[PDB]
Amino acid sequence: MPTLFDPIDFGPIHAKNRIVMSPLTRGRADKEAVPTPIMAEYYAQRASAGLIITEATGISREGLGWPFAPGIWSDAQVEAWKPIVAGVHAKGGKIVCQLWHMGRMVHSSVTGTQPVSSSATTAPGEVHTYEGKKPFEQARAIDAADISRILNDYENAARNAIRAGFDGVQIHAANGYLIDEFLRNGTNHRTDEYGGVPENRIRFLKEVTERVIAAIGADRTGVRLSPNGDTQGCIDSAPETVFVPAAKLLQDLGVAWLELREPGPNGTFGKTDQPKLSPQIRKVFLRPLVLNQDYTFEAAQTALAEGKADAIAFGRKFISNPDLPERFARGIALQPDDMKTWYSQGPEGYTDYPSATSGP
């Protein structure tokens, strides 16, 4: 029944279409994690998206390890976000701030402090720093004091997002970051009430969501989960035993919308024979369901036609096609994205991909 071009309501957010811009870390903020004027241009270019989900935005210095990524804990960050968000609204667009705690996926050279997690684990591979890739450090397992402080940071970030004029927030509970580190048995070795059985592994996500809901309203709160596929050293061996109850809980708490990132056995941003949980989650989460990863125009039109999703989020296509909706509507070819400028500092590979009007 619905097509990508039909409007949709994300709680009180009236989106003109069901073509969502997925959250994309670009590293065009400054070294104090304050957004920059070039980010106002980037988001305004993409305002024809029914909904923009921002790049992951740090809730705290502790939880932000990504060089040149923005935060939203500080008044200076809020002030820099305001015109970015205003430019999107002036174009009739909608935008939500993706709230990030990176958990063990940080380097102390960036945060000034030991990475923190569910448990004292080391992420595989290398971590981005201002001085190049470094070996990951072993994290420390957060205690009750840390959990109270981090819940405070999620609360403050949520309030600051509304203060900056955002239409809502999405809790980043995916891709092997803090919340996902609690959800997966691989990264959660805790002996306390946040460890062991599924309901315990879900409790951190529950407390974060409840605190954000209390601060800004359930109707302005979304979540992202990546149920299937080891993303960044983070696998559950029985994902349905934690991800379906998590989605059930998010339904029960009144969460306005859920996005699932689902790699395929032959994904371009993740590969896994761990099946997709989307169909099971669709039955237990009943408000708008956004699916993401390797969608094409036709795959997205078909997901919607078959009631598998209410909307589709596109990441890489929105890097290089600021007017993606218009291109889909008119059957215009999509431009390729330049991987080399995903995370560089300049306007090159950021604001210089033309619309199918503005250049060649």
Ligand X SMILES: Cc1cc2nc3c(=O)[nH]c(=O)nc-3n(C[C@H](O)[C@H](O)[C@H](O)COP(=O)(O)O)c2cc1C
**Which residues sit in the known binding site for FMN?**
22-23, 25, 56, 98, 224, 292, 294, 315-316
Q: Given the rule CB under 6 A, which of 23-31, 182-190, 193-201, 235-243 is the region that contacts ligand X?
A: 23-31
Q: Is 276 in the site for ligand X (CB under 6 A)?
A: no
Task: Provide DSSP, 22-78.
Answer: -------S-TTS---HHHHHHHHHTTTSSEEEEEEEESSSTT--STT--B-SSHHHH
Instruction: Kindly report the number of other CB atoms within 10 A of residue 213's CB atom.
Output: 19
Question: Catalytic: 177?
Answer: yes
Separation CA 300–CA 305 (nearest Å): 9
Q: Is 191 exposed, middle or buried (0-12, 13-18, 19+ CB in 10 A)?
A: exposed
Which of 6, 210, 240, 294 is in the footprint of ligand X by CB under 6 A? 294
In 3D space, the residue among 178, 171, 137 whose CA is nearest the CA of residue 157 turns out to be 171
State residue 323 phi and psi, 5-degree precision: -100, 40
Q: Is 96 helix (H, G, I), strand (E, B) or coil?
A: strand
Q: Is 121 in the site for ligand X (CB under 6 A)?
A: no
Q: Is 341 in the site for Na ion (CB under 5 A)?
A: no
On whether the CB atoms of residues 289 and 257 are closer than 8 A, the answer is yes
Least distance in angstroms from the C-beta of 25 to Na ion? 4
Q: Is 292 in the site for Cl ion (CB under 5 A)?
A: no
Q: Is 231 in the site for Cl ion (CB under 5 A)?
A: yes
Q: Is 261 in the site for ligand X (CB under 6 A)?
A: yes
Q: Is 25 in the site for Na ion (CB under 5 A)?
A: yes
Q: Give me the helices (H) in 289-355, please.
A: 297-305, 316-320, 324-330
Contacts of 98 (CB under 8 A, 6+ apart): 23, 53, 54, 55, 56, 57, 169, 170, 172, 224
Q: Which residue number, 21 or 80, has a Cβ lying nearer to ligand X?
A: 21
Least distance in angstroms from the C-beta of 56 to ligand X? 3
Q: Given the rule CB under 6 A, which of 134-142, 151-159, 199-207, 308-316 is the region that contacts ligand X?
A: 308-316
User: Which of 42, 43, 177, 295 is flagged as catalytic?
Assistant: 177
Q: Is 293 in the site for Na ion (CB under 5 A)?
A: no
Show contacts with ligand X in window 36-65 (CB under 6 A).
55-56
Residues of this chain that bind ligand X (CB under 6 A):
22-25, 55-56, 98, 172, 174-175, 224, 261, 269, 292-295, 314-317, 342
Residues of this chain that bind Cl ion (CB under 5 A):
112, 180, 226, 231, 234
